[PDB]
Amino acid sequence: TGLAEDGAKSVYERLKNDRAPYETRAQNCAQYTIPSLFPKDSDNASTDYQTPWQAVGARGLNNLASKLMLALFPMQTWMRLTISEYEAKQLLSDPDGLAKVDEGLSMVERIIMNYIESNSYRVTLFEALKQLVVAGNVLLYLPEPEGSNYNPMKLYRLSSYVVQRDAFGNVLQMVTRDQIAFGALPEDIRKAVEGQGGEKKADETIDVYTHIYLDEDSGEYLRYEEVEGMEVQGSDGTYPKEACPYIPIRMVRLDGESYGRSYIEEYLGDLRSLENLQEAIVKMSMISSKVIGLVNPAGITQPRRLTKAQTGDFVTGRPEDISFLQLEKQADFTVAKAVSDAIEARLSFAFMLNSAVQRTGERVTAEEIRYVASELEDTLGGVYSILSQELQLPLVRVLLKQLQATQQIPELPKEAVEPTISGRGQDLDKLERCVTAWAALAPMRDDPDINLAMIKLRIANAIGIDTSGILLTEEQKQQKMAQQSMQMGMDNGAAALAQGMAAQATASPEAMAAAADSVGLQPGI
Amino acid sequence: DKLERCVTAWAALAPMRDDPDINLAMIKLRIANAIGIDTSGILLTEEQKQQKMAQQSMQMGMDNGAAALAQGMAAQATASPEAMAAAADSVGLQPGI
Amino acid sequence: AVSDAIEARLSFAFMLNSAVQRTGERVTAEEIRYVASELEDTLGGVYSILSQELQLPLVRVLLKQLQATQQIPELPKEAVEPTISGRGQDLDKLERCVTAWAALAPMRDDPDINLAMIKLRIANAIGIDTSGILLTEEQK
Amino acid sequence: ASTDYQTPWQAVGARGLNNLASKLMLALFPMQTWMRLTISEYEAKQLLS
Amino acid sequence: PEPEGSNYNPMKLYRLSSYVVQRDAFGNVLQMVTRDQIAFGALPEDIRKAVEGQGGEKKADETIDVYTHIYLDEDSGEYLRYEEVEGMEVQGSDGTYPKEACPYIPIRMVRLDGESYGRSYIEEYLGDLRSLENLQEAIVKMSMIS
Amino acid sequence: ASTDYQTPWQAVGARGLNNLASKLMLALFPMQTWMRLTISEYEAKQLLS
Amino acid sequence: PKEACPYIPIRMVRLDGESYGRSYIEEYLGDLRSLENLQEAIVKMSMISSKVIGLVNPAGITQPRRLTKAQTGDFVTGRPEDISFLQLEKQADFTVAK
């Protein structure tokens, strides 16, 4: 069918002329930090990536992709499922069923963390976060789960995908190119390539274009994926607007333009300037490294004699003839060093690295100033905020739909949504502060006038806990009272007849022989 | 915070709780007025005080009562060998042990 | 001074605390030993891929090969493995919540607080599985 | 067998490799267990009492 | 190596001078080859029947190099491994390794798309070391004129 | 898409903005509840036992 | 209604009456703009510094022709006081602008 589009190859080729602004930024932007991270398309096995003269960009990227990772994808749970609490009160008999629902929400949030960690999503997100700093865009495809086998996700680094979005935030169409070799192509595709005609080599590389365009009708995406000239049979799929396995991440997203400029090309000009200093300081040390012996030619010493002498020889000559050429950029080496130590100082706050110990003399201070290192957290925070909506949430949503279809998760009843909280958190700390307040009420527990039944409610209201099942109701208090009595009833009762029976059983010698026969024992002891 | 500051003031009144002359029923109101808490349900009222007195007794009534007949029944149930066989049949158990 | 500056910016690239041959005095406290602690992030970036590449394959191969030689029980087709850096999460989440229960020891005898419910909520919050955690009616 | 490997004039690469292959080893292959087997918990609830 | 009994069974490493793999621009591996040159005496039994089966006597210490080939079968995406001595394959070499569980796994660090092997970690900073050496070569040589 | 944004020669404005948009955020939209609903207390006493 | 509309304009440093409100960081905008003109000059003073020009005294003996084919340790003709290097002299001036 026509499908209301030209063809995925073409869509990829018309809009490949829109990556070329961002792509030639990232090729420049990875050149200064770490050249192995965003290779130019021409680059191949042969290309050697010369290290930059400065090593702050290589430092301040791993020290920022890692901090971002810890913050965004903490090992400790980083999504939780909030049920809408008032609509949970209506559809349910309070209060035991409410936390029973939140156990099912604590059920799911552990299974996803057991799904993310057991499919190496921590790996390909850290490869994503390194692309999000240098390049600024990555597409992460969450392959449909097929069985409980190993199923890793895939990242396309803005050299293998194309998206097109609006001035408005929503995505219109996506294209990705992967070039899977003939042997490795999935079955249904091999029937289409052979169905096109002509034999192929086992290692010949076939490139498959998907096309994830927004259907005009229904705002549900359509995805058809295409090999060589035309579409594979069975490629057609429809992804709803809120749950599609292809989600493009962009950092520093700017209106409206389709991809988002990288984080480390914010300070790219400044790095580029740091490099031109650190290129010159090293080259000043190389003129220094050469050892030239300037012989004064109006003198007596002849190097001919100086160069066949042994360890201790007496040689003719004056010492003031032999001088050595030395570099004189001294009051100049300190100019270019103190600026390079000032540019590294103002990039080490821009990146989340505490600044290099090579610094001003002494001057190290206390925890107070380690609190300035603590203040580096705000700087960490601004960059990860967008990342959450862009990456954190989509991944969670896609996972939740995909686990319903493979029945690895219970079908949660259409009303639970998720905040990627940095993780309760608020449910733990608000229990605890209030629980200490109740001990503050331990001395007054026996007090005649203070309404301890009310103060425990007020402190709760104030911390903000839900109350509801927190206070024993009257029925429950009555039950508690009987249970202390039924304990002492069972305790004194079982101690009564056991003293009661065994006193009058063993009483009298014969009755004693009759009592042992009821168990099964003999008369003699 | 206004709950808490005042709640510490009440512990400052723990040593004097048994004092004969200090109106501890009034000092707990004044500290409250001063912190600025709403009072109102803070102080047990007459009905509540009576109920609390009663509950300590109904606790000791249920506690000593349930310990009485359980010592009361089981002493005279297991008293005598035959009455003992009759008592085990009411639960459902056999005569031999 | 250039060779002491190039060794300084390779000693952070490698996971070695930089050579003591350095600027005079200037040694500081645990706070700055926390910068040595921050060397862990740099350690982390390089080992992440290594995990998928080496850690997991070795474990998978070992698991199949131990089934064929009967040195392992045939695990029933549904268990998968995360190379966690090791529980870990099963130990620490037990423990934090277990301290919270002692925080509830003074109030154990309190007439109004539903201690049967607070022990459930703290559990829900730490994130432990509950399920067998609370004695049921029969067990009580 | 004959080749003699001349030591480099700098000894940071010889330092910063053993000090990085060892740290990587401790981190990746800790003596303490470094794999654990997660059973799928919801499918474990279904097939079991 | 496949466990054979509860005896001692160490694994083996081939350091990019003894193996060859070929993978796609996509992440998956197509074919692997390794060369080990086990001497005649040490060659495992079934291989000695193939080398003698080729013909001609061998010295006890003459070194024979055995190529394995771990190519991805076009059919079924299950690997096939046949290993070969001199000109042709040993009897019994054939084995089939599923895609997710094969005893030959190539590790690569700093894996880069798509190219088959991955550039080393310490050649990230290789330029910088190489520059450190040219200083430390000069400081030592200045102490020798001294 | 083409425009390249040259970094300013100083990096205090880039520093002092993220360090001020973040502090403002923590202060204004704290994770801990930052609105509460006051009922008019005297009119709540009248309409209620 | 007047009190509940989904479009609410936020303005910071709201000034009477004018419709939008001047930004916070253009309070100190003049001052930043002045900081930039210093930090542009300090960096450009380090770039003249970065260039390494070998000023040979042309009334001397040393000839750079010999100095530039010498190996690591060669004995070469000449006086050391002929070869000097041009260096930037804004020193008591780099500390004013810093």
Curated annotation (Swiss-Prot), chain E:
Superkingdom classification of source: Viruses
Location(s), subcellular: Virion
Disulfide-linked positions: none
Primary role: Forms the portal vertex of the capsid. This portal plays critical roles in head assembly, genome packaging, neck/tail attachment, and genome ejection. The portal protein multimerizes as a single ring-shaped homododecamer arranged around a central channel.
Family statement: Belongs to the podoviridae portal protein family.
Subunit details: Homododecamer. Interacts with major capsid protein. Interacts with the tail tube protein gp11. Interacts with the terminase large subunit. Interacts with the internal virion protein gp14.
Name of the protein in question: Portal protein
Organism of provenance: Escherichia phage T7 (Bacteriophage T7)
From Swiss-Prot, chain G:
Protein name: Portal protein
Lineage: Viruses, Duplodnaviria, Heunggongvirae, Uroviricota, Caudoviricetes
Summary of subunit composition and partner proteins: Homododecamer. Interacts with major capsid protein. Interacts with the tail tube protein gp11. Interacts with the terminase large subunit. Interacts with the internal virion protein gp14.
Domain of life from the UniProt record: Viruses
Signal peptide residues on this chain, from the entry's feature table: none
Protein family (similarity comment): Belongs to the podoviridae portal protein family.
Intracellular or extracellular location(s): Virion
Free-text function comment from the UniProt entry: Forms the portal vertex of the capsid. This portal plays critical roles in head assembly, genome packaging, neck/tail attachment, and genome ejection. The portal protein multimerizes as a single ring-shaped homododecamer arranged around a central channel.
